[PDB]
Amino acid sequence: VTFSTVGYGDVTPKIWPSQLLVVIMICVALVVLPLQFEELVYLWMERQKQTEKHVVLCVSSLKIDLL
Amino acid sequence: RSSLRIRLFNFSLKLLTCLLYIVRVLLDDPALGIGCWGCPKQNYSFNDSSSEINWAPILWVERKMTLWAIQVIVAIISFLETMLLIYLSYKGNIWEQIFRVSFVLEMINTLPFIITIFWPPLRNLFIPVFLNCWLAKHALENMINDFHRSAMFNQVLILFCTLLCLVFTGTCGIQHLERAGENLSLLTSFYFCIVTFSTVGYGDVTPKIWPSQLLVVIMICVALVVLPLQFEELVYLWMERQKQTEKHVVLCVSSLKIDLLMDFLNEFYAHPRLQDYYVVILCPTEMDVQVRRVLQIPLWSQRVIYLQGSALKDQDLMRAKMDNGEACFILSSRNEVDRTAADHQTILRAWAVKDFAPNCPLYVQILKPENKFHVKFADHVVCEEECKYAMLALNCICPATSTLITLLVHTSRGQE
Amino acid sequence: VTFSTVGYGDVTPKIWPSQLLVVIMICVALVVLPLQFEELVYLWMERQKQTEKHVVLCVSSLKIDLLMDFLNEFYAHPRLQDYYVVILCPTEMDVQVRRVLQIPLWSQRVIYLQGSALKDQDLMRAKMDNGEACFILSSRNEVDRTAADHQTILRAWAVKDFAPNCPLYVQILKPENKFHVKFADHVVCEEECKYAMLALNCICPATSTLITLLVHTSRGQEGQESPEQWQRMYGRCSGNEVYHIRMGDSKFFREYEGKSFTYAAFHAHKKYGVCLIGLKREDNKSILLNPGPRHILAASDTCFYINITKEENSAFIFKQEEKRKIAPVLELAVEYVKGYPPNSPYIGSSPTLCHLLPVKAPFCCLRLDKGCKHNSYEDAKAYGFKNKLIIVSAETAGNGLYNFIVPLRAYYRSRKELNPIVLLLDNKPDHHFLEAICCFPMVYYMEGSVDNLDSLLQCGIIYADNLVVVDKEAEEDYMADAKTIVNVQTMFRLFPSLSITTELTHPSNMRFMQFRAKDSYSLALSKLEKRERENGSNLAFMFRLPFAAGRVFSISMLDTLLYQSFVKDYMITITRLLLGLDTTPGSGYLCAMKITEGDLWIRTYGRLFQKLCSSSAEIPIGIYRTESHVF
Ligand SMILES: [K+]
Ligand SMILES: [K+]
Ligand SMILES: [K+]
Ligand SMILES: [K+]
Ligand SMILES: [K+]
Ligand SMILES: [K+]
């Protein structure tokens, strides 16, 4: 519930080292996950390039008048 | 340059006074007593039921004699150099210097310390020195245009810089505004701000008075109108920026088609000895769409490497690691309407690879027989017109010689 | 704190009506705000379509070879480090240019604006009114050079109309369009300099190499780690450039006040190693190369000298001087007629006194293959020439090819050493060209090219001293010279003893001129060239055998001659005076002399310097040294 930014508050750090770890761990997530997201965006970008009784229409160039 | 030394000093001077605020808040104890100066320091306490909030802890801050002395010295130096920079460069205008939001912040942080000299009782007064963030970040932005000390990194650092302060401005603000209530320590306030700007919002430490609640609302609104500006500039730079193992062979061609590629992969990789090899393709044109679909197949994704470049450019030769290549296949283009022009290109490409990597076995495919003697130096040369017509002629003596030669030059196990 | 998804929990709904309102408001936000974000994305998508001391670079299409040749030369000067460069090209930026412009070194300096010089708004965006210089360069890849020249004439007029007080630097392709841009501060004609340099290569070999290494700003640090002696001395002496300094304030020359030019040129070379090639009097603007021994120096003269380092930047040699501390040179001093050619093909053609036929030759006699009434000869064998021929394999014969013949037929050239000129054109020459050349002695033309062995054998390639190739000839940019390199290579194999001179668009193709793939030494020079490229040397092509011997030069050197003119306004005039493209009265010409065994009693270059300036008053620039390098 912390990394999903929910943060209920029923169980929270109560000592400063435990508070410091949460602050650091949030900062780590904000600098590690975007690197994975950026690589995912790159791979998604490169990747971008029924029933029965059908008939096929083989043409060389389809224009709106012919269709 | 002396001007760069001035800007660097100014940036160091802004970060120095931000630190000296921290050392003040670290060395100031409100529990011992607060007051204006000297006269009647009083102890203050928080009553939750009391709807009236004592502004004396907020208004008055107990400041040491030495700390106030070094602060006003730096503050005066801050004003002197900002006035120097303003007066040095008018740029043909006298107005529009105050409407830009860098001079008003410098006023609010600087002039009160000048006023505190006039009134010794007013020396222990609170001033938003922590806002010297935005001048320091702005000063770093101005300096980043001068020298590197890496194009997107400068914006990423600026985004980190505006993130670092947006905490800093919140933390000192939330802590001081909480001197009236809950007397939050600096570390606790810092933990509060981090979980606030990350939209976590635990709720173990929250504002309990309206001045503290209002600051959080404003600080959230500031984040929603400052961070997106950084993200948009980051998007622009990322968009503009958008334009292995050993035992590899290079395939230098002019235009790569799906028919030619598979005829190579089905033959080069049909040998077990050539399984660990990966293939570098050096074609000066953009990858054919049908080639991209094949190169995204898991079988060929890690083996075939497509580099867009020319064999006549040494950097493209360096990217292909031709000096370590086990072989270079310089193939000719048959779809071209000018075969002599095509032959001249593979002759230069053979010379370019031989000049760059002399100890690399060249494998040249020549179209016209008259250009064959320029690439006689190559380890293995194939002439298209020589073989094609000799096979056709042999078909007129011994029939289906073109089939006999075809089935002999294809690596198959005879399971068809 | 609710709509920012923080949700502290210190103040929360406690009854189901207030709880329900929060739920429906969170839902309302999730279905209303994305509508606003989508519209903002649309507008952002549709919307997607400094300091002082800047210079503008107005071109038609910007390519990586041209940009780097400018950046390496413009920024090689410490005075030009704070400058940033504005590029005004009407086309979208080339991909290879974007990669360079994203390099941290060039990101803040090079500014690329897409626009036309004929639009004042683009001129306003470039801040041309504040620009220190405008470089209007021409496009060589275009198939219509006359159309290209007309564009750079209008661009020169557009900048002069918008910012009249801005020094223009124009690069003109054809000589006939040169007089429209005569107003410009510094003009370079490509065809004028290319053909005069090729012609001089047939008189003084490797003149193209000599001129090239002088118009490149280098410190002479190339090849200093090479084990070969010829690579250390030739890589050091390449750092020479032509500088200027007033006579009175020149520690090199000020001690020669009242002495002759020949006296100062020798002793300065004898003492400090500088070569005083010419001066410019304060009264006139004309620059005289080797004004003569009769010229007496004065304290107000501007002295043009060749040296590795500038006088101001040579504080070490004066400091090194303080660490230590043949007749003598005097302190004081058919028969062809000689006349100017009748028909100058274009305006601005500098009139040079040339050897001329007594009677204008008819257009029929200027042809080799076809015989006429005066002679029935059909090839060079039938003519029975007494000297070796010069074969020029051009495409079309225009004003540029006219500039090839004038240096070869000048009056100071030897009459008995006149080389017959055979123009191997593939297009029939126009009558305008023949009207220009019909007066010159022994100038012929024949249809053909260098890719046809039959035409060259009829031209007289067996007894030809030189074969000059200038024929014109793609997305892959370096493939432009593919046809020229291979066609010259064929003759390098058929005629290994023939001396071929060639011009190439890109200097990186100079390695391919005479390619010996089964050669250890030539391919070893490739590694040496890589080290110079690693050391940031713009003279990387320097150590190739063809370029060093003068066989090939790239016309990209004329780009550098124009960029250097921003810091050396005399460079264009100095180069033209060497090529003879402008004939200032009282100015010298570039000659060449051959040292035989009869001159071996002169041990060193310095002693030869003394001999010439004490008797013949000649000032030697350099040495064409040839060794035995069995392959
Ligand atoms: K959240
Ligand atoms: K939350
Ligand atoms: K929460
Ligand atoms: K088999
Ligand atoms: K130099
Ligand atoms: K030089």
JSON list of C-alpha atoms in Angstrom, two decimals, chain B residues 145-148 150-151 192 195-196 199-203 205-207 213 216-217 220 224 232 235-236 239-241 243 284-285 308 310-314 318 344-345 347-349 351-352 354-358 371 373-374 376-377, chain C residues 1 4-11 44 47-48 64 92 95-96 98-99 102 104 107-108 474-479 481-487 489-490 493 508-509 511-513 515 517-518 522-523 526-527 529-530 533-534 544:
[
{"chain": "B", "resi": 145, "resn": "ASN", "atom": "CA", "xyz": [23.54, 27.44, -20.53]},
{"chain": "B", "resi": 146, "resn": "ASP", "atom": "CA", "xyz": [27.18, 28.52, -20.17]},
{"chain": "B", "resi": 147, "resn": "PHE", "atom": "CA", "xyz": [29.20, 25.31, -19.77]},
{"chain": "B", "resi": 148, "resn": "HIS", "atom": "CA", "xyz": [28.65, 21.58, -19.39]},
{"chain": "B", "resi": 150, "resn": "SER", "atom": "CA", "xyz": [25.12, 15.57, -21.43]},
{"chain": "B", "resi": 151, "resn": "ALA", "atom": "CA", "xyz": [22.08, 17.26, -23.00]},
{"chain": "B", "resi": 192, "resn": "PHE", "atom": "CA", "xyz": [6.03, 14.24, 6.19]},
{"chain": "B", "resi": 195, "resn": "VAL", "atom": "CA", "xyz": [5.14, 11.03, 1.72]},
{"chain": "B", "resi": 196, "resn": "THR", "atom": "CA", "xyz": [3.01, 14.06, 0.80]},
{"chain": "B", "resi": 199, "resn": "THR", "atom": "CA", "xyz": [0.75, 11.14, -2.86]},
{"chain": "B", "resi": 200, "resn": "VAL", "atom": "CA", "xyz": [1.10, 8.48, -0.15]},
{"chain": "B", "resi": 201, "resn": "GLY", "atom": "CA", "xyz": [-0.30, 10.53, 2.74]},
{"chain": "B", "resi": 202, "resn": "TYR", "atom": "CA", "xyz": [0.02, 8.20, 5.73]},
{"chain": "B", "resi": 203, "resn": "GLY", "atom": "CA", "xyz": [-1.68, 10.56, 8.18]},
{"chain": "B", "resi": 205, "resn": "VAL", "atom": "CA", "xyz": [1.88, 13.40, 11.05]},
{"chain": "B", "resi": 206, "resn": "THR", "atom": "CA", "xyz": [-0.63, 15.92, 9.69]},
{"chain": "B", "resi": 207, "resn": "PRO", "atom": "CA", "xyz": [-1.24, 19.67, 9.93]},
{"chain": "B", "resi": 213, "resn": "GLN", "atom": "CA", "xyz": [-3.14, 23.22, 6.48]},
{"chain": "B", "resi": 216, "resn": "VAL", "atom": "CA", "xyz": [0.10, 22.16, 2.37]},
{"chain": "B", "resi": 217, "resn": "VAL", "atom": "CA", "xyz": [-2.77, 23.04, 0.02]},
{"chain": "B", "resi": 220, "resn": "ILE", "atom": "CA", "xyz": [0.40, 20.85, -3.53]},
{"chain": "B", "resi": 224, "resn": "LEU", "atom": "CA", "xyz": [0.90, 20.67, -9.86]},
{"chain": "B", "resi": 232, "resn": "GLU", "atom": "CA", "xyz": [7.03, 18.81, -20.71]},
{"chain": "B", "resi": 235, "resn": "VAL", "atom": "CA", "xyz": [9.36, 15.10, -23.12]},
{"chain": "B", "resi": 236, "resn": "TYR", "atom": "CA", "xyz": [10.71, 17.50, -25.76]},
{"chain": "B", "resi": 239, "resn": "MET", "atom": "CA", "xyz": [11.47, 13.20, -28.40]},
{"chain": "B", "resi": 240, "resn": "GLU", "atom": "CA", "xyz": [14.24, 15.15, -30.13]},
{"chain": "B", "resi": 241, "resn": "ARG", "atom": "CA", "xyz": [16.82, 12.62, -28.91]},
{"chain": "B", "resi": 243, "resn": "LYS", "atom": "CA", "xyz": [16.31, 11.00, -34.02]},
{"chain": "B", "resi": 284, "resn": "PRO", "atom": "CA", "xyz": [22.56, 3.01, -45.91]},
{"chain": "B", "resi": 285, "resn": "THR", "atom": "CA", "xyz": [18.75, 2.92, -46.13]},
{"chain": "B", "resi": 308, "resn": "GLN", "atom": "CA", "xyz": [22.20, 2.13, -41.03]},
{"chain": "B", "resi": 310, "resn": "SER", "atom": "CA", "xyz": [27.90, 3.41, -45.36]},
{"chain": "B", "resi": 311, "resn": "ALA", "atom": "CA", "xyz": [30.97, 1.23, -45.80]},
{"chain": "B", "resi": 312, "resn": "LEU", "atom": "CA", "xyz": [32.77, 4.36, -47.03]},
{"chain": "B", "resi": 313, "resn": "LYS", "atom": "CA", "xyz": [32.34, 6.05, -43.62]},
{"chain": "B", "resi": 314, "resn": "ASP", "atom": "CA", "xyz": [34.83, 4.80, -41.04]},
{"chain": "B", "resi": 318, "resn": "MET", "atom": "CA", "xyz": [33.74, 1.14, -36.51]},
{"chain": "B", "resi": 344, "resn": "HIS", "atom": "CA", "xyz": [31.03, 0.86, -58.97]},
{"chain": "B", "resi": 345, "resn": "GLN", "atom": "CA", "xyz": [29.46, 1.02, -55.51]},
{"chain": "B", "resi": 347, "resn": "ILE", "atom": "CA", "xyz": [33.96, -1.87, -55.86]},
{"chain": "B", "resi": 348, "resn": "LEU", "atom": "CA", "xyz": [34.31, 1.16, -53.58]},
{"chain": "B", "resi": 349, "resn": "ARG", "atom": "CA", "xyz": [32.74, -0.78, -50.70]},
{"chain": "B", "resi": 351, "resn": "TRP", "atom": "CA", "xyz": [38.06, -0.99, -51.26]},
{"chain": "B", "resi": 352, "resn": "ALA", "atom": "CA", "xyz": [36.65, 0.72, -48.17]},
{"chain": "B", "resi": 354, "resn": "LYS", "atom": "CA", "xyz": [40.00, -3.53, -47.40]},
{"chain": "B", "resi": 355, "resn": "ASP", "atom": "CA", "xyz": [41.36, -0.09, -46.47]},
{"chain": "B", "resi": 356, "resn": "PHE", "atom": "CA", "xyz": [39.76, -0.11, -43.01]},
{"chain": "B", "resi": 357, "resn": "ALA", "atom": "CA", "xyz": [40.22, -3.81, -42.15]},
{"chain": "B", "resi": 358, "resn": "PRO", "atom": "CA", "xyz": [42.88, -5.26, -44.49]},
{"chain": "B", "resi": 371, "resn": "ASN", "atom": "CA", "xyz": [34.30, -4.74, -63.23]},
{"chain": "B", "resi": 373, "resn": "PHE", "atom": "CA", "xyz": [39.23, -7.30, -62.13]},
{"chain": "B", "resi": 374, "resn": "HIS", "atom": "CA", "xyz": [38.98, -4.35, -59.74]},
{"chain": "B", "resi": 376, "resn": "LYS", "atom": "CA", "xyz": [40.31, -9.59, -57.90]},
{"chain": "B", "resi": 377, "resn": "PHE", "atom": "CA", "xyz": [42.08, -8.97, -54.58]},
{"chain": "C", "resi": 1, "resn": "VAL", "atom": "CA", "xyz": [-5.68, 16.48, -0.40]},
{"chain": "C", "resi": 4, "resn": "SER", "atom": "CA", "xyz": [-4.44, 15.02, -5.21]},
{"chain": "C", "resi": 5, "resn": "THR", "atom": "CA", "xyz": [-4.83, 11.36, -4.11]},
{"chain": "C", "resi": 6, "resn": "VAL", "atom": "CA", "xyz": [-3.01, 12.12, -0.84]},
{"chain": "C", "resi": 7, "resn": "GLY", "atom": "CA", "xyz": [-5.79, 11.24, 1.59]},
{"chain": "C", "resi": 8, "resn": "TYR", "atom": "CA", "xyz": [-4.28, 11.99, 4.99]},
{"chain": "C", "resi": 9, "resn": "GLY", "atom": "CA", "xyz": [-7.23, 10.72, 7.01]},
{"chain": "C", "resi": 10, "resn": "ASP", "atom": "CA", "xyz": [-7.24, 13.38, 9.74]},
{"chain": "C", "resi": 11, "resn": "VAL", "atom": "CA", "xyz": [-10.54, 14.76, 8.40]},
{"chain": "C", "resi": 44, "resn": "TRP", "atom": "CA", "xyz": [0.01, 20.23, -27.71]},
{"chain": "C", "resi": 47, "resn": "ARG", "atom": "CA", "xyz": [1.27, 23.03, -31.72]},
{"chain": "C", "resi": 48, "resn": "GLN", "atom": "CA", "xyz": [4.31, 20.80, -32.41]},
{"chain": "C", "resi": 64, "resn": "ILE", "atom": "CA", "xyz": [27.49, 16.55, -42.62]},
{"chain": "C", "resi": 92, "resn": "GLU", "atom": "CA", "xyz": [14.48, 19.79, -42.94]},
{"chain": "C", "resi": 95, "resn": "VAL", "atom": "CA", "xyz": [19.58, 13.12, -39.78]},
{"chain": "C", "resi": 96, "resn": "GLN", "atom": "CA", "xyz": [23.38, 13.00, -39.66]},
{"chain": "C", "resi": 98, "resn": "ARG", "atom": "CA", "xyz": [20.95, 16.24, -35.90]},
{"chain": "C", "resi": 99, "resn": "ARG", "atom": "CA", "xyz": [23.26, 13.64, -34.35]},
{"chain": "C", "resi": 102, "resn": "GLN", "atom": "CA", "xyz": [23.08, 16.88, -30.19]},
{"chain": "C", "resi": 104, "resn": "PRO", "atom": "CA", "xyz": [27.46, 18.66, -26.19]},
{"chain": "C", "resi": 107, "resn": "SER", "atom": "CA", "xyz": [24.59, 21.88, -29.08]},
{"chain": "C", "resi": 108, "resn": "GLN", "atom": "CA", "xyz": [25.01, 25.42, -27.72]},
{"chain": "C", "resi": 474, "resn": "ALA", "atom": "CA", "xyz": [22.52, 9.67, -54.85]},
{"chain": "C", "resi": 475, "resn": "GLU", "atom": "CA", "xyz": [21.31, 9.12, -51.29]},
{"chain": "C", "resi": 476, "resn": "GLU", "atom": "CA", "xyz": [24.52, 7.52, -50.02]},
{"chain": "C", "resi": 477, "resn": "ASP", "atom": "CA", "xyz": [26.56, 10.70, -50.25]},
{"chain": "C", "resi": 478, "resn": "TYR", "atom": "CA", "xyz": [30.10, 9.35, -50.53]},
{"chain": "C", "resi": 479, "resn": "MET", "atom": "CA", "xyz": [29.08, 7.32, -53.61]},
{"chain": "C", "resi": 481, "resn": "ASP", "atom": "CA", "xyz": [32.66, 9.91, -56.88]},
{"chain": "C", "resi": 482, "resn": "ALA", "atom": "CA", "xyz": [32.08, 6.18, -57.50]},
{"chain": "C", "resi": 483, "resn": "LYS", "atom": "CA", "xyz": [32.12, 6.52, -61.30]},
{"chain": "C", "resi": 484, "resn": "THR", "atom": "CA", "xyz": [35.09, 8.90, -61.41]},
{"chain": "C", "resi": 485, "resn": "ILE", "atom": "CA", "xyz": [37.26, 6.79, -59.09]},
{"chain": "C", "resi": 486, "resn": "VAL", "atom": "CA", "xyz": [36.70, 3.53, -60.97]},
{"chain": "C", "resi": 487, "resn": "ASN", "atom": "CA", "xyz": [37.13, 5.06, -64.43]},
{"chain": "C", "resi": 489, "resn": "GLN", "atom": "CA", "xyz": [41.40, 3.34, -61.69]},
{"chain": "C", "resi": 490, "resn": "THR", "atom": "CA", "xyz": [41.00, 1.51, -65.01]},
{"chain": "C", "resi": 493, "resn": "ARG", "atom": "CA", "xyz": [45.98, -0.27, -64.51]},
{"chain": "C", "resi": 508, "resn": "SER", "atom": "CA", "xyz": [37.74, 11.16, -47.82]},
{"chain": "C", "resi": 509, "resn": "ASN", "atom": "CA", "xyz": [37.63, 9.56, -51.28]},
{"chain": "C", "resi": 511, "resn": "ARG", "atom": "CA", "xyz": [42.40, 7.16, -50.68]},
{"chain": "C", "resi": 512, "resn": "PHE", "atom": "CA", "xyz": [40.66, 5.46, -53.63]},
{"chain": "C", "resi": 513, "resn": "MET", "atom": "CA", "xyz": [42.45, 7.32, -56.44]},
{"chain": "C", "resi": 515, "resn": "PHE", "atom": "CA", "xyz": [44.17, 1.82, -54.96]},
{"chain": "C", "resi": 517, "resn": "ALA", "atom": "CA", "xyz": [44.77, -3.52, -52.34]},
{"chain": "C", "resi": 518, "resn": "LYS", "atom": "CA", "xyz": [47.72, -5.94, -52.20]},
{"chain": "C", "resi": 522, "resn": "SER", "atom": "CA", "xyz": [49.52, 2.00, -48.58]},
{"chain": "C", "resi": 523, "resn": "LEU", "atom": "CA", "xyz": [47.14, 0.21, -46.21]},
{"chain": "C", "resi": 526, "resn": "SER", "atom": "CA", "xyz": [45.21, 4.09, -43.15]},
{"chain": "C", "resi": 527, "resn": "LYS", "atom": "CA", "xyz": [46.17, 3.43, -39.53]},
{"chain": "C", "resi": 529, "resn": "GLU", "atom": "CA", "xyz": [45.23, 8.54, -40.75]},
{"chain": "C", "resi": 530, "resn": "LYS", "atom": "CA", "xyz": [43.09, 7.12, -37.92]},
{"chain": "C", "resi": 533, "resn": "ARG", "atom": "CA", "xyz": [41.51, 11.72, -36.79]},
{"chain": "C", "resi": 534, "resn": "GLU", "atom": "CA", "xyz": [41.76, 10.71, -33.13]},
{"chain": "C", "resi": 544, "resn": "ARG", "atom": "CA", "xyz": [47.63, 9.53, -48.70]}
]
